[PDB]
Design a protein around this nucleic acid. Sequence first.
RNA 1: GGGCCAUCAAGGACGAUGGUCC
RNA 2: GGGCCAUCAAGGACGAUGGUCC
Lengths: 59, 59
Amino acid sequence: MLILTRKVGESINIGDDITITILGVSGQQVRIGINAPKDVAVHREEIYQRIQAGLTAPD
Amino acid sequence: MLILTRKVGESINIGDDITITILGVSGQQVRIGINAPKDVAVHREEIYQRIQAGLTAPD
RNA sequence: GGGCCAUCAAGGACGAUGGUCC
RNA sequence: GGGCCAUCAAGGACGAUGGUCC
């Protein structure tokens, strides 16, 4: 697993079509952004594992 | 652009082969990890833009 | 306007809301 | 053990180091 260290306002990159950003921090909480095409799925771990269970997002 | 909020010890997911984690915080600094295959590139924004300039890693 | 804390957010938005202090 | 600040890390490791305060 690759790891990196950055500060509020910086970014990271993946593949040739994905980019990630650290918009800020709030104690034990964190605020981050993602810049991938809607051609690929993007979800929290608390819900990605329920989507990939054999279903899709609700109405 | 998609934005999420996360906490130290939790994760996010992208595509069907990429996962991201927030290992902790350090004030204005942050510690984060990436769990993608080495079949896709993963670098900091401060260097990815120098790789894709027309060259590759120093080794 | 800012610091601190908590919750929601199948959301594609540099996402939202509540509490506390100045 | 923890808060704050700074640096290295083309790194694939839940990466490293320094300053400051309690």
